[PDB]
Symmetry: D2
Subunit: 116 residues, 4 copies
């Protein structure tokens, strides 16, 4: 798992389950290329997005569909989505966890990078 | 003053000074239209971005150039920027403050909406 | 004004209004001695806790009664309070702003330190 | 485990390793009873603090010795230690992860609470 995304709900104190996540990589021409996507599990985790070979140095974007999440819980949110854009592997290979904590008016995101 | 941005550096314990901020509004196009921009002052605040007459209902994106801020201090941060996408004024006009807290591997962004 | 506290509610996108804040200073017997207290205003801000004369070097604790706040809004909170413990004035007098972002299962507290 | 603590470093974007963590439970004589302690692992995680049988309803404090952690990394921090205080098991038994992200001037803490 070179790349893992974790999503948490700060209103209920729970993993955010069945949240849609899209990942893109910036391509040579400044456009965003589709790279991976999925839905978070019961633990709020999305694994199996990429291989060590496919996950090269670059700029990556993680788009989180927060609005559908809230609406499915009966909340009409102010935040439309979250977009986290980061540089990877520029110092050589690392495992990355992109975590996001959601509220209807806020998010926080953290990156944890560890060396294999 | 309908839109303000306030930015704090949580690792150095200081306002984040001279940080570039861009604001976009979603067009019927579905395209992000440039709307306003400026730099944070010595207190980490950016006022005067827009006027009541220009800040109509819609979907807005605030992008804070955190990468340039950290690089100017010598630091290679994780993220290219901090951002928030929100719906504005859709139940009458409000004052919006976007509050951002920054570290090199994490950020939070919060929309604070008042009357007053 | 050497110590200020600013409190934001990240779930409702509002200042946290009428929240009790208590400040302690560690005494020479390692007990937390009561030092100052107040309630946040309509803007989420608490000014006037202490004077330059009374705010000497030491270790201080700021405790924000987040439990009573969430309870008043009909929200079950996790924490009894949000807190920061910091060393103050240990190399010259500074102005300290404690910035707290709140949600029912998450908080952040940041010491913002600035000069004369 | 009914209780896990995870500690992260926001400056380095890494788990915070060999961080001292003490857990207390508020007693009837409203003193803090020592309850458990340990040091975070290489993943920043501290497991095995308690058992289901011992982890009764109550008010708990998680104290994190952030000062010694920063000092070992050659930083003399303004933040002295974190004290995360919460009610546990008051809606019946749950599993708790208390996560904290550290800077020399700030911290952010989240609780994830799940029902097994
Ligand atoms: Cl981002
Ligand atoms: Cl904060
Ligand atoms: Cl606490």
């Amino acid at each position: 798992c070179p790349l893992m995304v974790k999503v948490l709900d700060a209103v209920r104190g729970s993993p955010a389950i069945n949240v849609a996540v899209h990942v893109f990589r910036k391509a040579a021409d400044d456009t965003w290329e589709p790279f991976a996507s999925g839905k978070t599990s019961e633990s709020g985790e999305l694994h199996g997005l990429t291989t060590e070979e496919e996950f090269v140095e670059g700029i990556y974007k993680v788009e989180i569909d927060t609005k559908s999440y809230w609406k499915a819980l009966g909340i009409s949110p102010m935040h439309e989505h979250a977009e986290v854009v980061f540089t990877a592997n520029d110092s050589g290979p690392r495992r990355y966890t992109i975590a996001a904590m959601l509220s209807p008016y806020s998010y926080s995101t953290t990156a944890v990078v560890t060396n294999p």
